[PDB]
Amino acid sequence: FEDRSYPIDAVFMPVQNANHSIHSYGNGNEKQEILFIEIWTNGSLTPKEALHEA
Amino acid sequence: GIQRDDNGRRIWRRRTLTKKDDMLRYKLQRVPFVEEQVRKIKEVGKVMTMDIERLLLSEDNRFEFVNSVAAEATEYVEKNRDEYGGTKKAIFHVLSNRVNDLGFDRPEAYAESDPYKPGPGYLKEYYT
Questions:
Q1: Which stretch of DSSP H or E encloses residue A47?
Q2: How far apart are CA B97 and CA B103, in angstroms?
Q3: B36 in A contact zone (CB under 8 Å)
Q4: Which of B32, B118, B122 is the closest to A40 by Cβ?
Q5: How far apart are CA A2 and CA B90, in angstroms?
Q6: I need a labelling partner for A26 at 20 to 30 A (CA). Which of A10, B32, B40, B75 fits?
Q7: Measured CA distances, B76 to A53, B80, B84, B99 (Å)
Q8: Nearest CA-CA partner of A17 in A47, A42, A40
Q9: Which candidate from B32, B35, B124 shows the least CB-CB separation from A25?
Q10: What biological function has been recorded for the protein in this entry (chain A) (predicted)?
Q11: 3-state secondary structure chain B
């Protein structure tokens, strides 16, 4: 509250957006599904680095 | 308007906008989060819907367009019977060729597959 300093309402979101999707496959009784993950970052982190950190 | 600067080079006035257009700054901006949307559009085949609408912008009668496309597809099938019916469809090939004839690059007959199929025998189960 001191020294008349103006705050900055920072939003700590290095990952701008993220999504996941599922693809399913199967031939009879045996099934299998695949996970896809999309990562958008603001350059302070690569999507691979974001994946590992998460 | 002719003027040479004593060395054989001709100096001329470049044409410039020299004015303010507010529509330039506000319109040349790109949305950053449409990768999945574009990929899904390509996967489901809406680019072909856009192509079909584009082809009809130059047709006075749409029934004539349909008849001509059907005739061209019939010629395609008669000339090379074995190449169509599976992954390549004659009508899709005709549409892609008519789009390509305008100078717009398209995959042949809009034929695409899934690179993530886990080997032979596995069929994708659609999630309704």
A1: helix A47-53
A2: 10
A3: yes
A4: B32
A5: 76
A6: B40
A7: 54, 6, 9, 16
A8: A40
A9: B124
A10: DNA-dependent RNA polymerase catalyzes the transcription of DNA into RNA using the four ribonucleoside triphosphates as substrates.
A11: CCCECCCCCECCCCCCCCCCCHHHHHHCCCCCCCHHHHHHHHHHCCHHHHHHHHHHCCCCCHHHHHHHHHHHHHHHHHHCCCCCCCCCCHHHHHHHHHHHCCCCCCCHHHCCCCCCCCCCCCEECCCC
Query: Given in angstroms, what resolution was this structure solved at?
Result: 2.6
Please name the residue of chain B whose CA is at the shortest distance from the CA of residue A27: B122
Two tokens, residue B89: 């469809």
Can you read off the two tokens belonging to residue B99?
Answer: 């789009």
User: Is residue A26 within a helix (H) or strand (E), and if so which, with residue range?
Assistant: strand A15-27
**How far apart (Å, rounded) are the C-alpha atoms in residues B83 and B76?**
9
Residue of chain A nearest B124, judged by CA positions = A25
